Amino acid sequence: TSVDCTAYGPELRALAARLPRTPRADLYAFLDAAHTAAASLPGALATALDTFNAEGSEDGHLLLRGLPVEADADLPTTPSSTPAPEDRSLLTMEAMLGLVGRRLGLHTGYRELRSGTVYHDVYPSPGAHHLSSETSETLLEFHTEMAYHRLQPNYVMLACSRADHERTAATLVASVRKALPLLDERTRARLLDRRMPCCVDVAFRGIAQVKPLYGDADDPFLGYDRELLAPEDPADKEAVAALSKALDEVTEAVYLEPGDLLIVDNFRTTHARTPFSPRWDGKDRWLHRVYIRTDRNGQLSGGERAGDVVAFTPRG
Numbered sequence: 001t002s003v004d005c006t007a008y009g010p011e012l013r014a015l016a017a018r019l020p021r022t023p024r025a026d027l028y029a030f031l032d033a034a035h036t037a038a039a040s041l042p043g044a045l046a047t048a049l050d051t052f053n054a055e056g057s058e059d060g061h062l063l064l065r066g067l068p069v070e071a072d073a074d075l076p077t078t079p080s081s082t083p084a085p086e087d088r089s090l091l092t093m094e095a096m097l098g099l100v101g102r103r104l105g106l107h108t109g110y111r112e113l114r115s116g117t118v119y120h121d122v123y124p125s126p127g128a129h130h131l132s133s134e135t136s137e138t139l140l141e142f143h144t145e146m147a148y149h150r151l152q153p154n155y156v157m158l159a160c161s162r163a164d165h166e167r168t169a170a171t172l173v174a175s176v177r178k179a180l181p182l183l184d185e186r187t188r189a190r191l192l193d194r195r196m197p198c199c200v201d202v203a204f205r206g207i208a209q210v211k212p213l214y215g216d217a218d219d220p221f222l223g224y225d226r227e228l229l230a231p232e233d234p235a236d237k238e239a240v241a242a243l244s245k246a247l248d249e250v251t252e253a254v255y256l257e258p259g260d261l262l263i264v265d266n267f268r269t270t271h272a273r274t275p276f277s278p279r280w281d282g283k284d285r286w287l288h289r290v291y292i293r294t295d296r297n298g299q300l301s302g303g304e305r306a307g308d309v310v311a312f313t314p315r316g
Ligand SMILES: CC(=O)N[C@@H](CCCNC(=N)N)C(=O)O
Pocket: 113, 131, 132, 133, 134, 141, 142, 143, 145, 146, 201, 202, 203, 225, 226, 227, 228
């Protein structure tokens, strides 16, 4: 689902201006400022975000296009390392992630991942591990983010400061609401609420059980990872292969361009990124990623604040 935010440019640049300019130096204060400012998002934008937050969508994602972003010459050189300097000045797309993210829920860091940071730069790196968001020339296959984590976030948000030079990297999304009707009853029934073994991302290494479909049988949530989900039982493997095929069959593509902020419903979709060739010239593709927790399905137990970092516990 898309929303052209071009008309909101001046108002959004004003809200971004309310925020502290060095976010990481006091991230709790920065996200608190963003929450207060989010109450002033232009009405139509706020309504769209709240509706998506409460109901999701059939296609599983809300793409905000045309948000303010610096001219390319005014952005820093694309980062070459992580984590980012705590003193880094606020970038406009990061301000958008603060405002939009707080309208939805609570930004969350994961202790073992990216040094426990909350804002992650997503750029290509040479010799990237194949499961890494730093990949470029190899397809980053479909995954629900951290499907195996008890504190898996409801949303993954990706804001774009630079697209890759040739604009070939496509962010793919497949929605359970479009895939489900393609599955027969036997398959849906085998998958629903059935725990299956699942490996974890490199950062969390050193076993999990994931239900590929779960919750209300007429509108289930989805936990799928093409690389990590590892059913052993043949009936389970067969049901997961049918799910895998249906997700491919309903794949949708978003080509992120500067000023875009894509909100992925991480309990109802799986996402991926197609190949692209980095130039290592200082202008490589550069997204900003944050994870947002909401009141749904046990993400929060009380007292959480946007900016908190949580430890790893596998679903079981
Ligand atoms: C949470 C996390 O580690 N995510 C990875 C990217 C997803 C890895 N792919 C699969 N899980 N199949 C990253 O490098 O950011």
